Design a protein around this motif. Structure first.
Motif, mmCIF file in Angstrom:
data_model
loop_
_atom_site.group_PDB
_atom_site.id
_atom_site.type_symbol
_atom_site.label_atom_id
_atom_site.label_comp_id
_atom_site.label_asym_id
_atom_site.label_seq_id
_atom_site.Cartn_x
_atom_site.Cartn_y
_atom_site.Cartn_z
ATOM 1 N N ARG A 46 30.919 38.048 30.661
ATOM 2 C CA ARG A 46 31.340 36.671 30.900
ATOM 3 C C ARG A 46 30.420 35.903 31.847
ATOM 4 O O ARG A 46 30.388 34.677 31.842
ATOM 5 C CB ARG A 46 32.771 36.641 31.465
ATOM 6 C CG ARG A 46 33.844 36.471 30.400
ATOM 7 C CD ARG A 46 35.248 36.494 30.995
ATOM 8 N NE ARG A 46 35.324 35.752 32.228
ATOM 9 C CZ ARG A 46 36.028 35.842 33.329
ATOM 10 N NH1 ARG A 46 36.945 36.760 33.582
ATOM 11 N NH2 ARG A 46 35.797 34.934 34.274
ATOM 12 N N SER A 93 40.716 50.967 34.014
ATOM 13 C CA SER A 93 39.918 49.914 33.357
ATOM 14 C C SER A 93 38.463 49.968 33.774
ATOM 15 O O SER A 93 37.553 49.733 32.959
ATOM 16 C CB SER A 93 40.508 48.527 33.653
ATOM 17 O OG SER A 93 40.340 48.213 35.015
ATOM 18 N N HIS A 94 38.207 50.269 35.052
ATOM 19 C CA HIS A 94 36.834 50.264 35.538
ATOM 20 C C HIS A 94 36.071 51.500 35.076
ATOM 21 O O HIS A 94 34.844 51.428 34.927
ATOM 22 C CB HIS A 94 36.801 50.088 37.063
ATOM 23 C CG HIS A 94 37.085 48.645 37.386
ATOM 24 N ND1 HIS A 94 38.274 48.012 37.137
ATOM 25 C CD2 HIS A 94 36.260 47.707 37.914
ATOM 26 C CE1 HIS A 94 38.227 46.740 37.518
ATOM 27 N NE2 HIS A 94 37.014 46.557 37.975
ATOM 28 N N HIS A 98 35.229 49.024 31.563
ATOM 29 C CA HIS A 98 34.076 48.298 32.118
ATOM 30 C C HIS A 98 32.897 49.178 32.440
ATOM 31 O O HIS A 98 31.767 48.674 32.531
ATOM 32 C CB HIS A 98 34.489 47.543 33.383
ATOM 33 C CG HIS A 98 35.738 46.731 33.230
ATOM 34 N ND1 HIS A 98 35.969 45.912 32.143
ATOM 35 C CD2 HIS A 98 36.852 46.603 33.991
ATOM 36 C CE1 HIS A 98 37.136 45.315 32.235
ATOM 37 N NE2 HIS A 98 37.703 45.716 33.359
HETATM 38 C C1 HEM Z 1 36.692 45.852 45.200
HETATM 39 C C2 HEM Z 1 36.279 46.303 43.885
HETATM 40 C C3 HEM Z 1 36.865 45.693 42.720
HETATM 41 C C4 HEM Z 1 38.112 45.219 42.436
HETATM 42 C C5 HEM Z 1 39.334 45.181 43.359
HETATM 43 C C6 HEM Z 1 38.115 44.761 41.063
HETATM 44 C C7 HEM Z 1 39.247 44.258 40.458
HETATM 45 C C8 HEM Z 1 39.192 43.818 39.152
HETATM 46 C C9 HEM Z 1 40.337 43.269 38.465
HETATM 47 C C10 HEM Z 1 41.734 43.109 39.062
HETATM 48 C C11 HEM Z 1 39.947 42.960 37.199
HETATM 49 C C12 HEM Z 1 40.843 42.418 36.074
HETATM 50 C C13 HEM Z 1 41.728 43.507 35.384
HETATM 51 C C14 HEM Z 1 40.905 44.685 34.872
HETATM 52 O O1 HEM Z 1 40.193 44.476 33.870
HETATM 53 O O2 HEM Z 1 41.031 45.756 35.502
HETATM 54 C C15 HEM Z 1 38.556 43.313 37.063
HETATM 55 C C16 HEM Z 1 37.835 43.112 35.890
HETATM 56 C C17 HEM Z 1 36.502 43.490 35.850
HETATM 57 N N1 HEM Z 1 35.739 44.148 36.787
HETATM 58 FE FE1 HEM Z 1 36.349 44.644 38.648
HETATM 59 N N2 HEM Z 1 36.843 44.931 40.565
HETATM 60 C C18 HEM Z 1 36.062 45.532 41.528
HETATM 61 C C19 HEM Z 1 34.738 45.930 41.471
HETATM 62 C C20 HEM Z 1 34.029 45.716 40.298
HETATM 63 C C21 HEM Z 1 32.603 45.925 40.221
HETATM 64 C C22 HEM Z 1 31.753 46.427 41.403
HETATM 65 C C23 HEM Z 1 32.195 45.594 38.966
HETATM 66 C C24 HEM Z 1 30.931 45.584 38.292
HETATM 67 C C25 HEM Z 1 29.682 45.687 38.975
HETATM 68 C C26 HEM Z 1 33.376 45.194 38.225
HETATM 69 C C27 HEM Z 1 33.315 44.788 36.903
HETATM 70 C C28 HEM Z 1 34.451 44.269 36.306
HETATM 71 C C29 HEM Z 1 34.433 43.737 34.959
HETATM 72 C C30 HEM Z 1 33.205 43.758 34.036
HETATM 73 C C31 HEM Z 1 35.653 43.215 34.708
HETATM 74 C C32 HEM Z 1 36.072 42.346 33.509
HETATM 75 C C33 HEM Z 1 35.681 40.831 33.679
HETATM 76 C C34 HEM Z 1 36.129 39.987 32.486
HETATM 77 O O3 HEM Z 1 35.372 39.964 31.498
HETATM 78 O O4 HEM Z 1 37.224 39.420 32.608
HETATM 79 N N3 HEM Z 1 34.475 45.297 39.059
HETATM 80 N N4 HEM Z 1 38.130 43.838 38.268
#
Ligand code: HEM
Length: 154
Positions: A46, A93-94, A98
Protein backbone atom coordinates in the motif's frame (compact mmCIF):
# COMPACT_ATOMS: atom_id res chain seq x y z
CA UNK A 1 12.32 -11.22 31.18
CA UNK A 2 10.34 -9.24 33.78
CA UNK A 3 10.09 -5.49 34.17
CA UNK A 4 9.63 -4.01 37.61
CA UNK A 5 6.66 -1.80 38.44
CA UNK A 6 8.90 1.25 38.41
CA UNK A 7 10.11 0.39 34.88
CA UNK A 8 6.45 0.04 33.76
CA UNK A 9 5.65 3.47 35.30
CA UNK A 10 8.39 5.11 33.27
CA UNK A 11 7.05 3.49 30.11
CA UNK A 12 3.43 4.39 30.74
CA UNK A 13 4.28 7.95 31.82
CA UNK A 14 5.83 8.80 28.44
CA UNK A 15 3.19 6.77 26.60
CA UNK A 16 0.52 8.99 28.18
CA UNK A 17 2.16 11.95 26.46
CA UNK A 18 2.32 10.06 23.14
CA UNK A 19 -1.45 9.44 23.40
CA UNK A 20 -2.09 13.17 23.33
CA UNK A 21 -1.32 13.01 19.59
CA UNK A 22 -1.50 9.42 18.34
CA UNK A 23 -1.68 10.34 14.68
CA UNK A 24 1.30 12.72 14.76
CA UNK A 25 3.49 10.20 16.59
CA UNK A 26 2.37 7.34 14.28
CA UNK A 27 3.37 9.36 11.25
CA UNK A 28 6.75 10.33 12.68
CA UNK A 29 7.57 6.78 13.59
CA UNK A 30 6.70 5.16 10.23
CA UNK A 31 8.49 7.93 8.33
CA UNK A 32 11.58 7.48 10.50
CA UNK A 33 11.44 3.75 9.86
CA UNK A 34 11.11 4.13 6.09
CA UNK A 35 13.85 6.79 5.85
CA UNK A 36 16.30 4.87 8.05
CA UNK A 37 15.59 1.39 6.66
CA UNK A 38 14.12 1.78 3.20
CA UNK A 39 13.94 -1.96 2.78
CA UNK A 40 11.03 -2.02 5.21
CA UNK A 41 8.89 0.05 2.86
CA UNK A 42 9.01 -2.80 0.39
CA UNK A 43 6.81 -4.95 2.75
CA UNK A 44 3.95 -2.55 2.36
CA UNK A 45 2.24 -2.91 -1.02
CA UNK A 46 0.00 0.00 0.00
CA UNK A 47 2.90 2.43 0.52
CA UNK A 48 5.69 1.00 -1.75
CA UNK A 49 5.16 3.80 -4.28
CA UNK A 50 5.87 6.75 -2.00
CA UNK A 51 9.14 8.31 -3.14
CA UNK A 52 9.92 11.14 -0.71
CA UNK A 53 9.33 12.26 2.87
CA UNK A 54 7.01 14.93 1.54
CA UNK A 55 4.86 12.33 -0.13
CA UNK A 56 4.84 10.24 3.02
CA UNK A 57 3.83 13.23 5.14
CA UNK A 58 1.00 14.01 2.71
CA UNK A 59 -0.39 10.54 2.79
CA UNK A 60 -3.70 10.23 4.67
CA UNK A 61 -3.48 6.46 4.35
CA UNK A 62 -0.06 6.29 6.02
CA UNK A 63 -1.26 8.46 8.85
CA UNK A 64 -4.30 6.20 9.34
CA UNK A 65 -2.04 3.15 9.49
CA UNK A 66 0.25 4.87 12.02
CA UNK A 67 -2.77 5.28 14.29
CA UNK A 68 -3.61 1.55 13.89
CA UNK A 69 0.00 0.58 14.74
CA UNK A 70 0.34 2.75 17.88
CA UNK A 71 -3.12 1.85 19.12
CA UNK A 72 -2.19 -1.86 18.94
CA UNK A 73 1.18 -1.24 20.61
CA UNK A 74 -0.40 0.86 23.34
CA UNK A 75 -2.84 -1.96 24.15
CA UNK A 76 0.09 -4.33 24.52
CA UNK A 77 2.17 -1.98 26.70
CA UNK A 78 -0.79 -1.25 29.02
CA UNK A 79 -0.94 -5.00 29.83
CA UNK A 80 2.42 -4.63 31.56
CA UNK A 81 3.63 -8.00 30.42
CA UNK A 82 0.35 -9.92 30.50
CA UNK A 83 -0.12 -9.64 26.77
CA UNK A 84 -0.41 -13.25 25.56
CA UNK A 85 -3.86 -12.75 24.05
CA UNK A 86 -2.93 -9.50 22.29
CA UNK A 87 0.18 -11.04 20.87
CA UNK A 88 -1.50 -13.99 19.12
CA UNK A 89 -3.32 -12.33 16.20
CA UNK A 90 -0.45 -9.85 15.71
CA UNK A 91 2.05 -12.67 15.49
CA UNK A 92 -0.06 -14.71 13.15
CA UNK A 93 -0.62 -11.90 10.63
CA UNK A 94 2.94 -10.60 10.75
CA UNK A 95 4.43 -14.09 10.40
CA UNK A 96 2.12 -15.62 7.82
CA UNK A 97 0.47 -12.86 5.91
CA UNK A 98 2.97 -9.99 5.97
CA UNK A 99 6.19 -11.97 6.53
CA UNK A 100 7.97 -9.56 8.81
CA UNK A 101 11.33 -10.77 10.19
CA UNK A 102 12.34 -10.03 13.77
CA UNK A 103 15.10 -7.75 12.47
CA UNK A 104 12.42 -5.36 11.13
CA UNK A 105 10.75 -5.30 14.55
CA UNK A 106 14.12 -4.22 15.89
CA UNK A 107 14.17 -1.44 13.30
CA UNK A 108 10.74 -0.08 14.30
CA UNK A 109 11.80 -0.28 17.96
CA UNK A 110 14.73 1.99 17.13
CA UNK A 111 12.33 4.35 15.31
CA UNK A 112 10.03 4.54 18.34
CA UNK A 113 12.91 5.31 20.66
CA UNK A 114 14.25 8.05 18.31
CA UNK A 115 10.90 9.80 18.04
CA UNK A 116 10.24 9.70 21.82
CA UNK A 117 13.70 11.02 22.49
CA UNK A 118 13.12 13.90 20.04
CA UNK A 119 9.62 14.83 21.19
CA UNK A 120 9.74 14.10 24.94
CA UNK A 121 13.29 14.76 26.19
CA UNK A 122 12.07 15.78 29.65
CA UNK A 123 10.15 12.53 30.13
CA UNK A 124 12.57 10.36 28.24
CA UNK A 125 15.90 10.53 30.03
CA UNK A 126 18.30 7.61 30.29
CA UNK A 127 16.29 5.62 32.83
CA UNK A 128 13.01 6.05 30.92
CA UNK A 129 14.71 5.03 27.68
CA UNK A 130 16.21 1.92 29.29
CA UNK A 131 12.73 1.01 30.56
CA UNK A 132 11.15 1.49 27.10
CA UNK A 133 13.94 -0.51 25.51
CA UNK A 134 13.33 -3.34 27.97
CA UNK A 135 9.56 -3.26 27.28
CA UNK A 136 10.22 -3.49 23.52
CA UNK A 137 12.83 -6.21 24.01
CA UNK A 138 10.25 -8.18 26.00
CA UNK A 139 7.76 -7.70 23.19
CA UNK A 140 10.22 -8.92 20.57
CA UNK A 141 11.31 -11.95 22.63
CA UNK A 142 7.70 -13.08 23.05
CA UNK A 143 7.00 -12.51 19.35
CA UNK A 144 10.10 -14.51 18.36
CA UNK A 145 8.86 -17.43 20.45
CA UNK A 146 5.42 -17.21 18.89
CA UNK A 147 6.95 -17.01 15.41
CA UNK A 148 8.68 -20.30 16.08
CA UNK A 149 5.48 -21.91 17.27
CA UNK A 150 3.76 -20.72 14.10
CA UNK A 151 6.50 -22.10 11.85
CA UNK A 152 8.14 -18.90 10.65
CA UNK A 153 10.88 -17.93 13.19
CA UNK A 154 11.66 -14.73 11.18
C1 HEM B 1 5.32 -2.24 16.86
C2 HEM B 1 5.28 -3.17 15.74
C3 HEM B 1 4.07 -3.30 14.97
C4 HEM B 1 2.75 -3.25 15.29
C5 HEM B 1 2.13 -3.02 16.67
C6 HEM B 1 1.99 -3.50 14.09
C7 HEM B 1 0.61 -3.56 14.09
C8 HEM B 1 -0.07 -3.78 12.90
C9 HEM B 1 -1.51 -3.85 12.83
C10 HEM B 1 -2.46 -3.69 14.02
C11 HEM B 1 -1.84 -4.10 11.54
C12 HEM B 1 -3.26 -4.33 10.99
C13 HEM B 1 -3.83 -5.75 11.27
C14 HEM B 1 -2.90 -6.86 10.77
O1 HEM B 1 -2.82 -7.01 9.54
O2 HEM B 1 -2.31 -7.51 11.66
C15 HEM B 1 -0.62 -4.21 10.77
C16 HEM B 1 -0.61 -4.45 9.40
C17 HEM B 1 0.61 -4.54 8.76
N1 HEM B 1 1.89 -4.53 9.26
FE1 HEM B 1 2.37 -4.20 11.20
N2 HEM B 1 2.89 -3.64 13.05
C18 HEM B 1 4.17 -3.56 13.55
C19 HEM B 1 5.38 -3.69 12.90
C20 HEM B 1 5.38 -3.92 11.53
C21 HEM B 1 6.60 -3.87 10.75
C22 HEM B 1 7.98 -3.59 11.36
C23 HEM B 1 6.27 -4.09 9.45
C24 HEM B 1 7.01 -4.16 8.23
C25 HEM B 1 8.36 -3.70 8.11
C26 HEM B 1 4.84 -4.32 9.40
C27 HEM B 1 4.17 -4.57 8.22
C28 HEM B 1 2.79 -4.62 8.22
C29 HEM B 1 2.03 -4.78 7.00
C30 HEM B 1 2.65 -5.00 5.61
C31 HEM B 1 0.72 -4.68 7.32
C32 HEM B 1 -0.47 -4.57 6.35
C33 HEM B 1 -0.70 -3.11 5.81
C34 HEM B 1 -1.90 -3.02 4.87
O3 HEM B 1 -1.71 -3.32 3.68
O4 HEM B 1 -2.97 -2.68 5.40
N3 HEM B 1 4.33 -4.22 10.69
N4 HEM B 1 0.44 -4.02 11.64
Amino acid sequence: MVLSEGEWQLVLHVWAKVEADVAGHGQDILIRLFKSHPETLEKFDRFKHLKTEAEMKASEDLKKHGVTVLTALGAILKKKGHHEAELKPFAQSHATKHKIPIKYLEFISEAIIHVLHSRHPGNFGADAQGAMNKALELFRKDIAAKYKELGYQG
